[PDB]
Amino acid sequence: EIKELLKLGDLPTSGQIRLYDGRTGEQFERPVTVGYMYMLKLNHLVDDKMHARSTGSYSLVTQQPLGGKAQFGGQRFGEMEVWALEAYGAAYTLQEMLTVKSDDVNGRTKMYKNIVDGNHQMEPGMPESFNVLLKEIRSLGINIELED
Amino acid sequence: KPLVGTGMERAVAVDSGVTAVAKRGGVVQYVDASRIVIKVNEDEMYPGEAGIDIYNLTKYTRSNQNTCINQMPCVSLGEPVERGDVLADGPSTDLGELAL
Amino acid sequence: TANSGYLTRRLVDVAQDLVVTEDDCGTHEGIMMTPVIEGGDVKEPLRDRVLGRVTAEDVLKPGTADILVPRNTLLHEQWCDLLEENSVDAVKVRSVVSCDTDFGVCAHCYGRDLARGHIINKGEAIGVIAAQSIGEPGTQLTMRT
Amino acid sequence: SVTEFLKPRLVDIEQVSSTHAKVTLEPLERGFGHTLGNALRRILLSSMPGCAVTEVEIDGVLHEYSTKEGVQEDILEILLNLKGLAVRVQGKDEVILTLNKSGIGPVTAADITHDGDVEIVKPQHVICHLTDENASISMRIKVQRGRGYVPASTRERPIGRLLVDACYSPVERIAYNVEAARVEQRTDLDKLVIEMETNGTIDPEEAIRRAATILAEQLEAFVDL
Amino acid sequence: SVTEFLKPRLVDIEQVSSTHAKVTLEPLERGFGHTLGNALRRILLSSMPGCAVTEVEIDGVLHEYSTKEGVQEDILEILLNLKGLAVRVQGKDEVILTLNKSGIGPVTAADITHDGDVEIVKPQHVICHLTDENASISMRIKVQRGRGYVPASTRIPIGRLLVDACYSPVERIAYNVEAARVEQRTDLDKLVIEMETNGTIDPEEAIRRAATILAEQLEAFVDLEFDPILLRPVDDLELTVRSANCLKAEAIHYIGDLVQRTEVELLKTPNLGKKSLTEIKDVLASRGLSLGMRLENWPPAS
Amino acid sequence: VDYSGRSVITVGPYLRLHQCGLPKKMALELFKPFIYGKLELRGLATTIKAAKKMVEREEAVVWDILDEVIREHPVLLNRAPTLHRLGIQAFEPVLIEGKAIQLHPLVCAAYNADFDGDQMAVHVPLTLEAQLEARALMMSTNNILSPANGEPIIVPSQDVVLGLYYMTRDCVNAKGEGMVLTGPKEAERLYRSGLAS
Amino acid sequence: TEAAVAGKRDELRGLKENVIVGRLIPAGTGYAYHQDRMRRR
Amino acid sequence: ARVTVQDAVEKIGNRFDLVLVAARRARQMQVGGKDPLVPEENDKTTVIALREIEEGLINNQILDVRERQEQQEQEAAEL
């Protein structure tokens, strides 16, 4: 029936015609299936997907960057990414991910100042979440401390 | 319209309350981009009543997904209409058929 | 997917601290490697099981007492070709399980990097690499009976 | 001689319609037919200039997402209809047309106020419809010349001035064919037939000449090198 | 404004060899790179005047599939060697050459009989190898003038061995289109053409002649710094006499020079005490400037 | 972490193996302190607030500054879930127009990614050690063998395989059959001229 | 609970322990740093 | 530019030590006043250091010897 309808419209039965390249004008070596299809635009727009951040706001407790695009949030570097970095042997990249980018308050300021001055060096420091963990464990009646 | 369908587009378009459907038959007395006034036939009019149906169309309103809901008339001035006919097309609707 | 993730997380946790911290431990122990034969079919030849490994003993010719491959030799492609020339069906090699190194393993008991062409360097976290290598194809397996 | 090439000339121009034409170039050497045809098609489809509507003002409207009482179409649909208006401006690079209409019926391009330097090539182009007897519409339409596609986003204005994306290209489609030409005493010459479909706002011969001039001016850089 | 188009500004030429060249042109209007490249490639491949060998006659050979005694190569090998021979002809459009050679060694293009009109671009071009001492080669070669490539199959006496005719000097040509950006416009083309010739003419000359041919084909239709405050003199600041004298002695004339001077260096300057340095810092602070600013290349050739 | 972003990925067929396609709107935000430092370095801005306002206004010179500062500075591309260490790789950015990240096809197998809605995250190394680790350890050109088994990970697939298979095939009676050629260049010249199949 | 009862002490020798406290892991490019620390200790 | 670092790895012998040596040289060229030992072509300090290492002009022993010589010269010229 489709072939009969194509014949009624003076069109090839096979549904394939000859096409030419728009940049060179030469014919493609094989017939190409050309027709009409119903296409839909889905509710996944890149305008709602693209997001980037250099610096912004942080949590009051963990002092880490917030999440989401509604706020000027950062991307989460989870355990699997840490494993991937460990498998490469890139210790400095992991260390700068852990301290000067997320939750080292003095390290963030020092790194920003050094970057603005053209000195690409960092002072790692101690994450704040470790201090929060120490305080929370001490609140349970357990004496945990750093020594030496 | 899909131009290649299955025959279920009209049922989806009508059963969904996105379109304006004539409650009673008559003649299009007034047509506008925002309102439609239908003069009801005298054989469908209730006693002691001026027989007119007024349809106020939804124009550029926000949906739950922050999209646009807008209704467009699909009838002309003075043409006859019957009960169940489509008077306005809602979003993703073309002459009473689903058009995604 | 969740089962694969749990398995790979446990595998990473159990071996996260294993690092190549030595060049040679001097051990003589090892494991015997033979081709994998099931019934009347060979699913794994000897070449793919000893390639890139270090011999734990002198490999002798089957009919004589002549050393064909000396001890502490990294079996590259040419050594495998030499072994298959003389029809060798069992080679004793060094493995990380039989390693005398304390708090880590040595390069000789591990062997080839498998990402480069040379022997493994010191300071490589081979436990995490192993856990990721085992866990990555976990989504290609079947979970339902 | 083998270093001397016979050069083509414009032989026949056929006006099948007001927006459909055929142009004949003859004679051509072996291989020059496609070589000229592809370049001419690309230049005609890419670099032709024309006039387009860019700005609209309606008395009673504030933005494109509203409706006017007595008009069956939304303002956005009216703007979309105006995007397709074909106008030939012969004296300036910018003009403002005025439209005034009242009474029940279709409002088309023939209702635009006459101007000496402005020609409307399709008077039957429907713009909108008035459904109320006591309904009138008055608008000012800004038309200017350019080339290519310029969305309004890429290019303060008072409230009520509506921007419309400009498509200045007058050419709708181009096709070309190479046939065997019948010259006096040779059988190794070709003839190039160019079928051109436009909106009726440009002469085919001047379009061909403009494309040839563009090609020559772009190619003159390779002559010196 | 509607009839003006971009023109190439940076035409870079890389000469890989005497016959191989690479040309780069940018910027171009969107889509024009493909147009120009395709047109030039088609012209340089199909329609390019030149001179080439057409057919040969060997005394001892009567058929294409034969066996010549004493010659290391086959007859079709000799035909392939002849197809690669590039010859310049100025006098006529059809010349005949003779090759007669006896002995042992490589018979090459240097052994052809000399003629005023005929010029051989590569006399070292190997034609064949003569092995036996009592062996000789005798052949007659016809060279004609034409355009492009003509296979010998389309042309299908006795002993006339046909050879594919390659009149076009171009041996290879390819083009590529890449992205280039002006400060505002971004969707613009950059054209790179790599071409190798046979040695008769230069690649630049071949490109020029192809462009000239295409242009003549259309004759019937073509119608005719730093911030300004840094450049102000140090006399702009209302410094005291002593401070001004110290700065003049320190060979400081502009604000940038003083700005690039650190406090430690200025402290060691004779006749410049801490009070004068504090005054200088104060007058710099009144304009939002400090003493610890660095500049890559401060003097702007002025 | 800071200095990070994400967006949808498209295919860049023109890219080299060590290159990626980065939108310039993302790059302007990612490299903001570097842009501030470079603006202050060459006298365009005399204070930090001047550079801040210049970047906010998006002047013409800040794009040249960005192009200069992103010249040789690797960025890390990661796709979740990161099943192995090949899920994070280092690339040299190329500034592009739009909002999608262009990805080299040959590295799509290591990421297990396809162009039907996938999104990737981008991270910027800060220190010299991090940049040199990205260039010498996490660069794509360094990852050509699988650490699990030693097999290559840059296997061509689909369109490239189809094209190479089509071009390297013979037909019994094709145009131009039975002639002798001086070399590959003559074969290409014959093919482009329509004289041989 | 078991560690608190036993009064255990952690030497921070593994990768995860150094990741917790934001130090260089004793592997890859951080191996020389830990070797130098051990030699100086 | 740079696409591969295989030659530098072969010269140094280890990928992990190459990063440290190149970082040391790049920090000398960036923060310090040292000039490159190779003709720089619009390259950054990391790429310049890698090119210097590839040519054999820079290694750990050379850097240590240069540091010792500079310290001795400074201590001698201090008086």
Place this chain on the structure above:
Amino acid sequence: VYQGETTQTLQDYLMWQVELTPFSDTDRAIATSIVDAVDETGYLTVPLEDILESIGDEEIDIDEVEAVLKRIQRFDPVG
């Protein structure tokens, strides 16, 4: 669980601008003292003699404090 967000006040902005300004150690301490004594409306709430006393060093005159204050007064917002 709720944690909240860190908000940037006038003093945070002033200290951020101070840290990115080529000050010396003494000048940075003076700038910290000056920024400390700034109220919500942007006015200095103490005389410069109090700032000089708060510095705690006997080698600094009122002129250096004046210069640092004039440099700070040109930050954003101006005044």
